């Protein structure tokens, strides 16, 4: 008998629907992320950070410092051999 009006009721609609939560989630997820690996600070030196940079990053990751640390125990007690026996 009259004009019905659901073309323009998106005003208080855009809270209730389910991907609104994902939309408001990832507009918050996307702003403070650094763009392209920026602010990396790829070099730092504290007399042993170079040891981590050469040995303990994701790139090198080989067991050799263990080997070095193995030799460290080989370096340790054998000298104590020369202190004891």
């Amino acid at each position: 008998v009259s004009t019905l009006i659901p073309p323009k009721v998106v005003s208080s609609k855009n809270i209730g629907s389910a991907p609104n939560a994902k939309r408001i989630a990832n507009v918050v997820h996307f702003y403070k992320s650094l763009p392209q690996g920026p602010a990396p600070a790829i070099k730092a030196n504290t007399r042993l950070a170079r040891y981590k940079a050469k040995y303990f990053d994701g790139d090198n990751a080989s067991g050799k410092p263990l080997w070095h640390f193995a030799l460290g125990i080989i370096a340790f007690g054998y000298s104590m051999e020369y202190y004891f026996h």
């Binding site: 040891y51 981590k52 303990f56 990053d57 994701g58 990751a61 640390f69 193995a70 125990i73 080989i74 340790f76 007690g77 054998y78 104590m80 051999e81």
Partner: protein, 100 residues
């Protein structure tokens, strides 16, 4: 001074050397040195979840970790030949068991 107390110092230094220098600057991707403690965490997690089965089961999940790792590390140190016995003092280990 005690060489066994020095061995405890070596234990704490390697424990620092399992996570801290391991972590390449707090990355999500979980690098190759971190996959070790990742797998250890999961194989203790899936162990003691199905073991004790509590509704509050994780509350004792810390201690079972730190009772593991001490024994896991102190039996990877004397494996090197030129060493002294760490875990072979039955007085200390059985004392620990009596405490537990």
């Amino acid at each position: 001074l005690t060489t066994f107390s020095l061995y405890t110092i070596i234990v704490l230094l390697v424990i620092t050397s399992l996570y801290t220098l391991t972590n390449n600057n707090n990355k999500i991707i979980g690098s190759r040195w971190l996959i070790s403690q990742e797998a250890i965490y999961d194989t203790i997690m899936n162990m003691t979840k199905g073991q004790i089965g509590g509704k509050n089961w994780g509350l004792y999940f810390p201690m079972i970790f730190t009772l593991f790792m001490f024994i896991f590390i102190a039996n990877l140190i004397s494996m090197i030949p030129y060493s002294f016995a760490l875990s072979a003092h039955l007085v200390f280990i059985i004392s620990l068991s009596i405490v537990i």
